[model samples]
Every structure is written in structure tokens, then in C-alpha cells.
Target: KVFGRCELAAAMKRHGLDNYRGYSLGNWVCAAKFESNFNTQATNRNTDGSTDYGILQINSRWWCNDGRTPGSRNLCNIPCSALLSSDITASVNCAKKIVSDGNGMNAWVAWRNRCKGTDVQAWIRGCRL
Candidate 1:
């Protein structure tokens, strides 16, 4: 019935773009298609042998694997794990903060436009944002 953080992540990973702020949602969807084919469990191999995790393909070690302190800030501190919880919209909002310029949806739109020509629908849909 209700979509959770994972669902939201899947949605954003599908429609979110880190380029121009116009076709944000469409680009995100296109990215989802390209990145993981909408698979939340998607992962890729790195030359270093560590594995990236989740639908967004985030590397936990690169972000949340550290401690919290003056210089030990961890990406896990963000409310993203909620994506696996019962809050889908909240998760997407949080993700937009991370990838986008932190101006919320507007920033996401800007970022989505950065990948222009990759998908015309994505670019055009962003105009509605």
C-alpha cells in the first residue's frame, strides 16, 4: 500500500538526475533504468575489491563506514537509511539534499539537467519542475 524508503530510493534512482535542474524527475527515472535497472540490490565491482551497496549503488565505506567527530563525519548520519524504512518521500527528500545543491527539488532539477541528451523525456519532464 505505502512505499517505504527503499521504494522511494527506487523511484528517485529511476527519475533523479545529477545534471541540469530541469528534467530532474525524468532523468532520475532514466538513471534508474541505466544504473540498476531499478534493482535495489544492484552492485558493481571496483578495482579495490570493495562492493557498492543498495539501489543508489552507494559505497557505504566511502560514506557511512567512518565515525562521527570533528573530522569523522559519516554519510550514515543522514536520514537515508530511512529509505529501507516506511518513509519513502522522506528518503527521496533526503537523497535530493545529498546529490542536489541542497535547495530541495530545485537543486535536483538542476543536477538532472547535467545529463542532457541522454534522455529527451527526462529533460522535457524537468521543465515541469
Candidate 2:
């Protein structure tokens, strides 16, 4: 499922991403937009044969169990397939764990490249949540 901006805002804020790790709700929204356009089923393969899954592109090399990443950290203790669910609870949980792992929001490539220097608060300007 593809989420629109406000839907992402409401969902993310409802999930406590608003002030997580000193980043705002819109910061996450903006990063998600660039990462996967809020598409719940998004996935990507790493050059090193690892894979990333779902909205925030959690990596098998570091976060999820995908069975292909050698020396995988699998930190989130979840199946990579779980990240593709439209529910986003698992993806959001993994994302929270990622940033909290001391990687910071810059752990997300899209957040660093596309959202880093922007006033990402504008991403949620009209959100009713």
C-alpha cells in the first residue's frame, strides 16, 4: 500500500516517531518519501548481496533476518518479510530500534541526502494528526 503524506504523518505520529531521536515527525515523513515514496512493499538489494525491506528500507545486514546476509546483525529480531506489511508496526518498530542504536536519523541514506538540509516540518504542514 502506498501512503499519502498526511496518512504517514498520522500513522508515524501515532507510533511515537514525532520526537524520536531529536528528529521531528515530518523529518521521518520526508525521509520515507525519498526512501520508498511511502510504499509499504518496497525493497532493495545491496551491492554486497544484502537486502533492504519495506518502507524505511531496514537492512538484512544490520537489522532483519533475511537469510542472505553473511555476518548479519539481525538486530531487530524480525523477519525481513515483516517489514513489507501495510500495517507498518513492525517497520516502525525496527526503524525506532535503528535510530536508537546510536546510528541516529542519518542512518537512513535518504534522510541524509534528501531530508537532511530541508525544513522537513513542511512535510506535515497540513497533517491533521
TM-scores for candidates 1 onward, in order: 0.47, 0.96
Residue 22 of model 1, lDDT score = 49
lDDT of 1 by residue, 13-42 (tens): 554443435434555554444444555545
For model 2, residues 84-108, the per-residue Cα lDDT tens digits are 9989899999898999987699899
At residue 112, candidate 1 shows an lDDT of: 49
> Which regions of candidate 1 fall more than 4 Å away from where they truly are?
1-23, 66-73, 78-94, 101-115, 122-129
Poorly placed runs, candidate 2 (over 4 Å): none
Clashing pairs in 2: none
User: Weakest 10 consecutive residues, lDDT, candidate 2?
Assistant: 66-75
> Residue 54 lDDT in model 1?
40
